[PDB]
Symmetry: D2
Subunit: 388 residues, 4 copies
Amino acid sequence: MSFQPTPEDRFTFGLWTVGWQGRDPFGDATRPALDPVETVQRLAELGAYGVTFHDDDLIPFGSSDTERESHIKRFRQALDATGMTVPMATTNLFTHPVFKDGGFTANDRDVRRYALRKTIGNIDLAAELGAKTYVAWGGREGAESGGAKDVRDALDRMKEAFDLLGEYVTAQGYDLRFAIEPKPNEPRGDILLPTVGHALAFIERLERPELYGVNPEVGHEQMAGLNFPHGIAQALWAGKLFHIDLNGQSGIKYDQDLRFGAGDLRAAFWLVDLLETAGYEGPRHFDFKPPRTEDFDGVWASAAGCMRNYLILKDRAAAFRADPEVQEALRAARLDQLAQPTAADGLDALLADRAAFEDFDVDAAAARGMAFEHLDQLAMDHLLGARG
Amino acid sequence: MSFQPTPEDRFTFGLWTVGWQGRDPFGDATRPALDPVETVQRLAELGAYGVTFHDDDLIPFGSSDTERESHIKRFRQALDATGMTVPMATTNLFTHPVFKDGGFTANDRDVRRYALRKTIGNIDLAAELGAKTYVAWGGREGAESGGAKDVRDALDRMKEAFDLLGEYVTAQGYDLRFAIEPKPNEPRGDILLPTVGHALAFIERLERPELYGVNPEVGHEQMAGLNFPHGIAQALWAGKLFHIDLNGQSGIKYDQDLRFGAGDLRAAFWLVDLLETAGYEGPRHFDFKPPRTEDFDGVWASAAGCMRNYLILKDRAAAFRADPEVQEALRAARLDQLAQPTAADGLDALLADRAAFEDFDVDAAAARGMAFEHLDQLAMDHLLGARG
Amino acid sequence: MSFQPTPEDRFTFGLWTVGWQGRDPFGDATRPALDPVETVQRLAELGAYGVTFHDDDLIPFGSSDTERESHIKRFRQALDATGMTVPMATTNLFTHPVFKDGGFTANDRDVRRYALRKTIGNIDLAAELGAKTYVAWGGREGAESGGAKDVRDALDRMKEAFDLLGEYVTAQGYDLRFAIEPKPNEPRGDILLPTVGHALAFIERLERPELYGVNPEVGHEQMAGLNFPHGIAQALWAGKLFHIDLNGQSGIKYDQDLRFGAGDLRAAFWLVDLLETAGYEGPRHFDFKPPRTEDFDGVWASAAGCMRNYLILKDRAAAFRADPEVQEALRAARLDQLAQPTAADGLDALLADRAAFEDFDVDAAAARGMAFEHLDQLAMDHLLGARG
Amino acid sequence: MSFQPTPEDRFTFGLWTVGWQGRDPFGDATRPALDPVETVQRLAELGAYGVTFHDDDLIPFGSSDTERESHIKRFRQALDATGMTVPMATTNLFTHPVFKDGGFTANDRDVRRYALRKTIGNIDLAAELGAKTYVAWGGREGAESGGAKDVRDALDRMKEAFDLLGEYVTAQGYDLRFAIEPKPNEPRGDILLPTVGHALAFIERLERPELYGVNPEVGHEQMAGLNFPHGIAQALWAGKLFHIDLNGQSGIKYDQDLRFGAGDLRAAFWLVDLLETAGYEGPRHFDFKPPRTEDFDGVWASAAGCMRNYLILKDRAAAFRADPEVQEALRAARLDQLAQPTAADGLDALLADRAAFEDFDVDAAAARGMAFEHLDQLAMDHLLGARG
Ligand SMILES: [Mg+2]
Ligand SMILES: [Mg+2]
Ligand SMILES: [Mg+2]
Ligand SMILES: [Mg+2]
Ligand SMILES: [Mg+2]
Ligand SMILES: [Mg+2]
Ligand SMILES: [Mg+2]
Ligand SMILES: [Mg+2]
């Protein structure tokens, strides 16, 4: 029955999340702004651990440093008031007409110039609040048109931009690191660095890649219809899963930003299972919007569904891997053998074996049925009886 | 008028292309199996340059060392006869039942071990036909609904295969180069290395990344709904586009393999641009399937189609970047500036420079309309003319 | 723990289901044919209720009436042997080159002529085995090309065809009825009557529509990414849900034909819930293929996952609607008011009210938050604690 | 050369078209709000025939009976001034927060009751501007993740609205006609009546189906990945295509609203065919949004684009069905026969007729290649020329 987020399951929420007034393509804000002091108070009280924020979430675009300083101060009084942390921080580069056509990769050069600056102004802040990850999400970087942007030129600029930021952090001797969060489309026709692989492949070209990793969003990859779990496992493979955005989505459509556990449930389980197994140590961060039909408490309800959800799955998959029956389904499915190396020690000398080609009996191997519809149904009950 | 191809087009075809028979996932085969000698011979007439292959396309499954040979002499005699060429070869590791859970990533060690052997057999052939590049498309590497594969182990396994692969290719002085051929799903539910990005990233974890590069299909990225051109741009930036597969696909759906031009017409204009404006010297490989409703010149004409379509598109893009009225418009939207460094000398001291930020007029800049809509119309009247 | 199909939960399987040898686009049958006598024996024993069959599943295409009669006889000996029923029957019109390009709507006229005949030959059989539904699935009816078929002409033929079949049944005084099962694509580019609505809208034009209804497949509608439950509720709305095809799928891709409960779990629950509530009385029919990695028992495992699955969901949704807390979430969500009529008795005289326009307080109504993220999470646990 | 539109094109634009400002789901507004008088005036220059509208497009939300009036005189004075026209009007029932769970299908009876009233207010206007047809696009009618709406009650409710609607329209002698405007998702997660089919079907359950018909968008069916032309064919067969919304969409993704020609170029050729070969006399309504990267002639040119593109496409299809070489090919693939009754006199006695079946040569017929690939190439060289 009653799963309890304890500020140590590392649940953190982007200020923009519960803060979403409900304004959409086709309609008016269905709710009022929340004050970041108010937010922090209330996530603390649900068992949260921290907030994450875009510059503008905190500090409204007009920056009278006076005003500005008395924003951060108000903020910071809550963090200790409540004991909440700010793990991660980002820049808003997609809501001001300026950004119409990107930031790092905008056509005009002072827009690329402004945009770094805007961002360098907040890494610092990211530093001071002791965040340990600085995320970067393209948003206005792609092509609302067609051949309106030469993508290697553009891909040069992405690089230039990232290569300058890493230089600053190095220089200033800051203890952050970056996380490129890719997205297929919405709002630009086609966004640049559109999947965990792209982002991942891109990082390899940067001066110091050891500084850069990814920040995948469940629903973002779902939007190109891909296995998220498979994508995240690649990230982990690369030593690159530096942060995660947990939310729900229902297959290829606009960014929905549903509650976590909502949308694709089986993929939630398979996700969580993995995060629990591959030891992700990071912050179980949530980037969802409680829907706009959904009310002052609706926000929190939706906030909390987020946590009940990682917590049940976390469990159902726990009592899954530990099912003796289940562990004898897995071996039946030769998952132990996947785990063995194909050609070990001293040997590219499978060349000289017969048991491998000349003599190998295909139809023997042919005959052995994979035994996965049975493992699947063990995991479909969440073990036996009960679901998950 | 009509745009006849010639050998210097570098237009290739898989034997499995024009030679597909109709065996869909729900029907029978609508065509007689055509033979190599025949295939090579009409291609040569159509205006084709090379021919590509699979082991099993050429050498029937269980054949002998002699039944092998006679195939190969025969193939070989007709290349010269026609002076056609074989710039690329590939291994079938997905049709036979032993390959039901995969080849390099089977949960069963001696199939893993058998797919390496079968591959080496073919490298050696490909090798001796002067194949310049060696392709590799999984197909059976994924999971229909997994608990069935730890994607972290498979990637261990996947890597090991290729590393083994690159040793032999170098062990053996061949002048060959690997090319991972991504695909999202079908036949698997989820295919490991589903796209260009994942693949590109993957190559960088390999132990000799220079022997790798990527072999994309238009339809295959289209199945994830990516932006093919965009995608090839990222591969031509990585300097990793070793070979391409030209195609037509009408949306996130089963692998169609429509003739090139077919599918996203417009996507196609931008590729020949990219490809033609970018210097791709590789072959224009057509991995398309002539619809099953069609007889032999049914077959013979779609394949013709494939080539007129590169050629008309070659044309119309060529002229796009030569309409004086278009060059105006490339300036207009500042494509020029995309092509200028953002902050060029050492140059992080870009930092106090009061115009980047302090004294920058976002209000002024925001007002700049991108002049994208008129560049897009221009490339529609293919410039100020008759269609693109 | 251990949910028991009792031949009265109406679980029935298409002979082609468990019978699937595993042959796909890219590979060889991974299994042998099962003999329909063998199948029937084995579904009986899992708690099934009946089999459904295409003509050709039973009676292999060459029809020596001698042979043929001694096929049906063999069959029919099992049905009473086991007590299994044949509720539904169909025609295979998509695997013979003949059908390359449709049946009812094929370009050539004797192919449309053959095809009715082929089908009239089996309605009779459908009659004799006492089936009560005769399903029709397009499959080869659509456009692998582009403007290769004039769709109103074609839509005339669909009509002609259906209008002739209904005439026969009327005439012969048979007690069947038809169920058009639509599909978006796979194998023809674009299939005609592609969604429950299309099929539904089409039925209205036929001479006697009272004879015709739909036979939706979960994964078919999923393939156009639509809500199945919403689609089925429309069918029920029309008095047209005449049969159902239960299977799983993972979003927009090729027909997967996964186990029921597999793919989109939340939509399974929402489906089942509804079928259980809207009183569907029909046969909980399954059209799935146990995957080709998946073995002689794998087949049955997968068969049985099908049933464990409708049976748990059937339960979790049972103890959902009956949760007092849940019933006080629903009222909180004004679902009782949806159920009330907007403008009743004698009245289009909302015209004369003020409480409806002139005086109506928007912001009052504006303010009331829908209370659906809370109902959702009740249904996300399956009530409380336990999932579903 | 260049293809100038004129009034007899019957090309319309929504005021919300060229007048969109940029407010995306993640950015601010990139444009000043343009006024009606302005809108009507440049359209008139562009070469436009009519203008369509929403209540709130024209008359600002809470305006008075006088603030109303002055708007209307003003709109009205500029129609004549320019002699433009208003063939269609529509009600905004999706932007204001009172419309957060829907209009006709809100789970709250006095919003339901308020959306009927607001609509009647506008029918009366539309009515007195000589609007020929009255559109209706939900947008807020669906569920983001439902347990939230019984789709059976909503359809009860949905039906009731429209029936009420058709009474007044007839009660009041207006010469108006309803047109349900389908859409799959966005802003809702799932939108009731997601497509042409569902809508078409729906109209037949209404109590005066003749006052209904359908208003499709290219992008909206494209969001379900249907086959737009196909879809419009089904509406022109039902004789239910009252009005169309021309557009560009690049795949199963958020509502783009690209200029017509934009998106599926090729889909577009087949529509003007269909539309032009089929006699649609209705307006060619452009519901497109000028990308936010663009200023006023940014705006002004995409909208120009929309119209040259119908016109070039009009051309190229016209000529398609006039290439003597094409008419050969329509014969070749027997388009002729599709257009002949299958079994024409009374004619079920088609039954013994030994050629339909007994004496039919399936083997002979199967061998007929459909000559689809060459008809498709012909409509590519738009015939034997320069592009389509
Ligand atoms: Mg995010
Ligand atoms: Mg999101
Ligand atoms: Mg390929
Ligand atoms: Mg392909
Ligand atoms: Mg079915
Ligand atoms: Mg299916
Ligand atoms: Mg519209
Ligand atoms: Mg639209």
